Amino acid sequence: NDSILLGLIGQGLDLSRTPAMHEAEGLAQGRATVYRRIDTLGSRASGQDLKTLLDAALYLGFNGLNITHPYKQAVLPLLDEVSEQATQLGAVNTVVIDATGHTTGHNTDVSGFGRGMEEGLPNAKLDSVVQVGAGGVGNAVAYALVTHGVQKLQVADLDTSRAQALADVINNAVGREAVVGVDARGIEDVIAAADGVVNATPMGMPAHPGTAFDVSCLTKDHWVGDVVYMPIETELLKAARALGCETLDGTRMAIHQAVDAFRLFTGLEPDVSRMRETFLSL
Amino acid sequence: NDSILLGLIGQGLDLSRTPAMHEAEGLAQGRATVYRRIDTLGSRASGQDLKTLLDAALYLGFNGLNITHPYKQAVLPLLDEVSEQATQLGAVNTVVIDATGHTTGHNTDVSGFGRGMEEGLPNAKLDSVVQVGAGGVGNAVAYALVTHGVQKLQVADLDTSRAQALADVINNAVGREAVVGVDARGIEDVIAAADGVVNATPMGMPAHPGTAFDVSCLTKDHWVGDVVYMPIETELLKAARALGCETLDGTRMAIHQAVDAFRLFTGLEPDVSRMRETFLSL
Numbered sequence: 001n002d003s004i005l006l007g008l009i010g011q012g013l014d015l016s017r018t019p020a021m022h023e024a025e026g027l028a029q030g031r032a033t034v035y036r037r038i039d040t041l042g043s044r045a046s047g048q049d050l051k052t053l054l055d056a057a058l059y060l061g062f063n064g065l066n067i068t069h070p071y072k073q074a075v076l077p078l079l080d081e082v083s084e085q086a087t088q089l090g091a092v093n094t095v096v097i098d099a100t101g102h103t104t105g106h107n108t109d110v111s112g113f114g115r116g117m118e119e120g121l122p123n124a125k126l127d128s129v130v131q132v133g134a135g136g137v138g139n140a141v142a143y144a145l146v147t148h149g150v151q152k153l154q155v156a157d158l159d160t161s162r163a164q165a166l167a168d169v170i171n172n173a174v175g176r177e178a179v180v181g182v183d184a185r186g187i188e189d190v191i192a193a194a195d196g197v198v199n200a201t202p203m204g205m206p207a208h209p210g211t212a213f214d215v216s217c218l219t220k221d222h223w224v225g226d227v228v229y230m231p232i233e234t235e236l237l238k239a240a241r242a243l244g245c246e247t248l249d250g251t252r253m254a255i256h257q258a259v260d261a262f263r264l265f266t267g268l269e270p271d272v273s274r275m276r277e278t279f280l281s282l
Numbered sequence: 283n284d285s286i287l288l289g290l291i292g293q294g295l296d297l298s299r300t301p302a303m304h305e306a307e308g309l310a311q312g313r314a315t316v317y318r319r320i321d322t323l324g325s326r327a328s329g330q331d332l333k334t335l336l337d338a339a340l341y342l343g344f345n346g347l348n349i350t351h352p353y354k355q356a357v358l359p360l361l362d363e364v365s366e367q368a369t370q371l372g373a374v375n376t377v378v379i380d381a382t383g384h385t386t387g388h389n390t391d392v393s394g395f396g397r398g399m400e401e402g403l404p405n406a407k408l409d410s411v412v413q414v415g416a417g418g419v420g421n422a423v424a425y426a427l428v429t430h431g432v433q434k435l436q437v438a439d440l441d442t443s444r445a446q447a448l449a450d451v452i453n454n455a456v457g458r459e460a461v462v463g464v465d466a467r468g469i470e471d472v473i474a475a476a477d478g479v480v481n482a483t484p485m486g487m488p489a490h491p492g493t494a495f496d497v498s499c500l501t502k503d504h505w506v507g508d509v510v511y512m513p514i515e516t517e518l519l520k521a522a523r524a525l526g527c528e529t530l531d532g533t534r535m536a537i538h539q540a541v542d543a544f545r546l547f548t549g550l551e552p553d554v555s556r557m558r559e560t561f562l563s564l
């Protein structure tokens with residue numbers, strides 16, 4: 001029943017649901033678990049370099065870390081080993097620390113989004129998909145999409161260069177032209193012709209109300225996904241559901257990234273329903 | 283029910299019972315608790331400076347640390363505040379870390395030994411006591427003795443200068459000549475005339491079998507204490523008990539230092555019997 005020590009290195013972490021998910025699941029499996037925010041905007045860790053914080057976790061007996069913005073790319077060269085997916089994406093969100101201090105990076109944003117597709121869109125047609133948004137989250141989402149059956153992914157971002165950089169990284173990772181950058185302007189016509197669309201922008205959040213594109217381009221035959229998890233039913237997903245579309249809400253990725261990280265950190269098989277219930281309770 | 287994160291910085295920590303005591307008591311009070319060894323002889327922390335390790339604990343959300351050999355003196359100048367007792371002794375074994383990272387040093391070896399006297403020797407005559415051993419543990423024990431009613435303490439060590447240094451520190455701390463260094467050679471005659479004697483040497487441990495002085499100097503009217511806690515009944519305490527002496531075993535200090543540290547770390551009132559039972563179970 002050895003206790004488990006985890007943390008999350010990033011900025012602006014107060015509202016994260018990840019600590020609670022891991023603390024509750026460890027306890028449910030008979031292992032007292034501490035999961036600390038390590039917030040470089042906060043009083044404890046501000047001003048410290050990522051390496052200092054990583055090294056600190058090694059010295060003081062952490063079993064694992066998650067890594068979030070702005071450190072998911074910066075962390076790679078600091079680690080002893082990086083999984084093939086995280087290496088090719090160039091982004092790590094999960095660091096397993098061995099008993100004796102060795103670090104291995106993984107990306108459970110990718111695996112978590114993919115699991116969400118399996119769990120919540122098992123029958124979705126995947127030939128042609130549009131993703132709007134090529135930021136940090138979007139990079140993992142795109143990789144997940146094209147490794148879980150999407151034949152052609154068109155990625156749009158207001159910053160065309162972000163979309164093109166994403167496409168290059170993912171296509172190299174998978175070894176085919178799976179992703180094409182397309183203009184954000186006129187994206188509705190591209191979506192109208194596709195099988196599905198995923199929002200990977202902040203649109204739909206309380207501080208970013210609305211949608212990333214005009215929802216009148218949707219049809220009843222589309223499926224629609226959203227990375228936003230608060231609210232769970234974004235304006236986009238409401239519009240999709242009104243037409244009878246299958247929808248994939250952002251909680252699936254948010255929960256499954258933690259399920260998969262917990263498994264990697266501990267070697268235990270997480271109970272998905274318990275972790276989901278923790279997430280929804282917050 | 284916020285989780286609690288603690289650790290112990292020192293060398294050669296595998297057999298410490300302190301982590302288990304704190305982990306169990308936190309859990310018993312409804313707070314998942316991790317207490318990590320931070321062992322500078324081990325794979326995680328070896329080669330690191332004390333300041334690096336202290337700073338690490340601040341950054342990564344520790345609520346407290348214990349400090350053991352060889353760092354109890356070295357830690358003082360690294361802390362924001364130090365209690366008056368720990369300051370005057372020049373040794374800290376407990377560091378409370380505030381929510382926002384401020385450190386306060388305390389010495390619960392002193393308070394713990396004193397509590398052990400109250401708990402286990404409530405009726406002991408304290409006019410004249412001999413202590414054999416003026417190492418690290420001995421410094422706290424001597425301070426506890428003379429602040430919990432001992433009028434004259436004679437301290438002997440094979441290294442006379444250690445005993446004399448101890449006497450100077452304690453006498454300055456209390457503001458009277460409470461302690462006198464005396465020769466180890468011939469200590470039996472000094473003990474014979476005293477009310478009680480405390481072993482603060484390694485003698486009695488499995489790897490240091492025997493006693494620090496010839497037990498034929500004891501009488502039925504003496505009380506006898508020992509800092510050794512494994513075995514609980516040292517050869518010294520066996521000899522004392524055979525005469526009908528009251529005895530103070532080393533587990534009292536070992537438990538109470540943790541009781542008092544837990545209170546300081548958490549603001550919760552520890553259950554002494556639960557912590558004692560954890561200690562004895564290991």
Ligand SMILES: NC(=O)c1ccc[n+]([C@@H]2O[C@H](COP(=O)([O-])OP(=O)(O)OC[C@H]3O[C@@H](n4cnc5c(N)ncnc54)[C@H](O)[C@@H]3O)[C@@H](O)[C@H]2O)c1
Binds near residue numbers: 069138157253
């Ligand atoms: N479900 C989860 O597990 C999870 C985890 C973290 C974040 N998120 C969500 O993901 C969202 C995106 O996070 P991020 O870190 O990638 O943000 P980001 O700001 O780094 O990237 C968002 C991208 O969207 C683009 N964009 C904004 N409006 C657009 C529009 N109308 N058309 C095309 N592109 C547009 C921006 O140019 C930017 O590159 C967050 O706001 C958050 O709501 C979800």
Ligand SMILES: NC(=O)c1ccc[n+]([C@@H]2O[C@H](COP(=O)([O-])OP(=O)(O)OC[C@H]3O[C@@H](n4cnc5c(N)ncnc54)[C@H](O)[C@@H]3O)[C@@H](O)[C@H]2O)c1
Binds near residue numbers: 418439440493494532
């Ligand atoms: N009960 C507790 O909470 C607790 C905690 C830690 C250690 N301990 C015990 O305390 C013991 C002492 O620890 P320490 O760190 O002070 O050790 P230390 O080696 O630093 O000090 C022991 C001192 O005893 C002296 N000594 C040895 N034999 C002697 C003798 N025959 N006569 C006079 N002096 C003699 C040595 O010269 C030395 O200065 C440990 O061996 C351990 O068993 C108890």
Ligand SMILES: O=C(O)[C@]1(O)C[C@@H](O)[C@@H](O)[C@H](O)C1
Binds near residue numbers: 066257
């Ligand atoms: O829940 C969060 O705050 C996270 O930062 C979200 C996402 O970035 C994950 O990859 C991290 O493991 C946890």
Ligand SMILES: O=C(O)[C@]1(O)C[C@@H](O)[C@@H](O)[C@H](O)C1
Binds near residue numbers: 290292299391
């Ligand atoms: O139990 C231990 O290992 C300790 O190191 C014993 C003693 O040195 C105490 O002061 C520490 O708090 C804990």
